[PDB]
Amino acid sequence: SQKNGIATLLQAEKEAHEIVSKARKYRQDKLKQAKTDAAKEIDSYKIQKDKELKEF
Amino acid sequence: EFNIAAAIGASVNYVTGVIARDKVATLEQILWRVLRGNLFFKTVEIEQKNAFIVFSHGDLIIKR
Numbered sequence: 001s002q003k004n005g006i007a008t009l010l011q012a013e014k015e016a017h018e019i020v021s022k023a024r025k026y027r028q029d030k031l032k033q034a035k036t037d038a039a040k041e042i043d044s045y046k047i048q049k050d051k052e053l054k055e056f
Numbered sequence: 057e058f059n060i061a062a063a064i065g066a067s068v069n070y071v072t073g074v075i076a077r078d079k080v081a082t083l084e085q086i087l088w089r090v091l092r093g094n095l096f097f098k099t100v101e102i103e104q105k106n107a108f109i110v111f112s113h114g115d116l117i118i119k120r
Binding site: 002003005006009010013014016017018 | 058061062065066067068069097099101110112114115
């Protein structure tokens with residue numbers, strides 16, 4: 001069992017690295033999702049300010 | 057041997073090493089087991105003299 005047990009830890013290290021790569025990818029996408037979910041309040045506030053200025 | 061699938065990558069923690077014999081590798085396994093617990097692999101391979109050793113650990117414990 002010298003060369004047989006190395007493949008189980010070798011696949012588990014690749015899956016554990018792929019899970020950390022997927023978590024880092026979701027953590028990298030969370031900032032763009034936060035900014036894309038954050039520009040809508042600036043747009044809705046700019047439209048309300050433009051409506052409040054155009055009304056006066 | 058133990059092309060290349062997990063010997064040139066970075067997703068698998070592999071540790072190679074040359075030794076004189078298995079008697080000198082037994083003291084390295086006793087020192088690694090006394091200073092690091094049961095978090096390693098103890099293997100020995102006969103070479104042409106030299107001894108083929110291979111260790112297995114995590115990918116983030118390569119510095120230790």
